[PDB]
Amino acid sequence: TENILRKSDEEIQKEITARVKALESMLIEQGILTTSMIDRMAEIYENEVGPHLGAKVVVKAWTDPEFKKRLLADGTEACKELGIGGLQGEDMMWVENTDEVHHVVVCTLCSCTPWPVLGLPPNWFKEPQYRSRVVREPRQLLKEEFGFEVPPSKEIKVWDSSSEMRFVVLPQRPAGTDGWSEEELATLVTRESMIGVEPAKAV
């Protein structure tokens, strides 16, 4: 939104860059931060940990009734079966979408998300607009922002992750996918479908 008091994005970026490089120089001299540490954290979340991991969990649940039960019973333990877990995903509780219920996740108090299965969240998920509105007008928000229309009669459960427990949505399996392989099914699972702002891809 317009704010006549705000500097240009270019000026904002130039100031932040200098402030961060300055702080970085100090932490480096203190011996608690190094360039290899920086590069390692970045490579992990730019190429290793992402929503493709959550997709693997979803497709296994879609094709393994027993795994699905275990997943809904104890998310952290189930995902460990696939070597999936870790930082900010130490405690996961998966919730299943059905014809009677739709789940949507948010962190109104900040921006928490289960990185081990979704990777670092897109900026809109961490911003004030989505966080403030989703717990108050979830149906309208889903329609207006994501073009996702949830029938009035269908209940919308909004999960506000205020603790370290991380909620992840197990989207319903799209129709027309009988007998599909886990690899083929994975193409339908999106980060958005596991947040609940969109259903898995149709067709």
Partner 1 sequence: MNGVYDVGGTDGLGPINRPADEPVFRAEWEKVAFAMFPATFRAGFMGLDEFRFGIEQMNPAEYLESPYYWHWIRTYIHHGVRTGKIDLEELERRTQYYRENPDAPLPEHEQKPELIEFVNQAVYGGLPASREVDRPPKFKEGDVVRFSTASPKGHARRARYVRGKTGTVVKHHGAYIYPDTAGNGLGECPEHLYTVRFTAQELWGPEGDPNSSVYYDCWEPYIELVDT
Q: Residues comprising the binding site?
A: 107, 110-112
- 162's tokens: 């205020």
What's the rounded Cα separation, in Å, for the pair 196 and 52? 16
Q: Which does 38 bind (CB under 5 to 8 A by kind): Co ion, partner 1, none?
A: partner 1
Instruction: Examine the residue annotation and report whether 162 is marked as an active-site residue of this protein.
Output: no
Instruction: Using the minimum distance from each CB to Co ion, give the nearer residue, 111 or 172.
Output: 111
Mind spelling out the 3-state secondary structure of 90-133?
CEEEEEECCCCEEEEEECCCCCCCCHHHHCCCCHHHHCHHHHHH
Q: Could you tell me if 120 and 174 are in contact, meaning their C-beta atoms sit under 8 angstroms apart?
A: no
Show contacts with Co ion in window 29-88 (CB under 5 A). Answer: none
Half-sphere exposure of 202 (CA within 13 A, CB side): 2
Show contacts with partner 1 in window 153-192 (CB under 8 A). Answer: 153-165, 167
Q: Could you tell me if 57 and 132 are in contact, meaning their C-beta atoms sit under 8 angstroms apart?
A: no
Show contacts with partner 1 in window 29-68 (CB under 8 A). Answer: 29-38, 40-42, 44-46, 49
Instruction: Examine the residue annotation and report whether 111 is marked as an active-site residue of this protein.
Output: yes
Residues in the chain: 203
The single residue among 67, 72, 96, 120 that binds partner 1, judged by CB under 8 A, is 120
What's the rounded Cα separation, in Å, for the pair 135 and 157? 9
In the complex, minimum distance from the CB of residue 57 to partner 1, in angstroms, rounded to a whole number: 16
Catalytic residue among 8, 25, 111, 193: 111
Q: Which residues on neighbouring strands pair with residue 168, listed in sequence order?
A: 94
In the complex, minimum distance from the CB of residue 183 to partner 1, in angstroms, rounded to a whole number: 23
Instruction: Using the minimum distance from each CB to partner 1, give the nearer residue, 162 or 181.
Output: 162
Per CB under 8 A, 82 contacts partner 1: no
The single residue among 110, 136, 155, 201 that binds Co ion, judged by CB under 5 A, is 110
Show contacts with partner 1 in window 1-20 (CB under 8 A). Answer: 1, 3, 5-6, 12-20
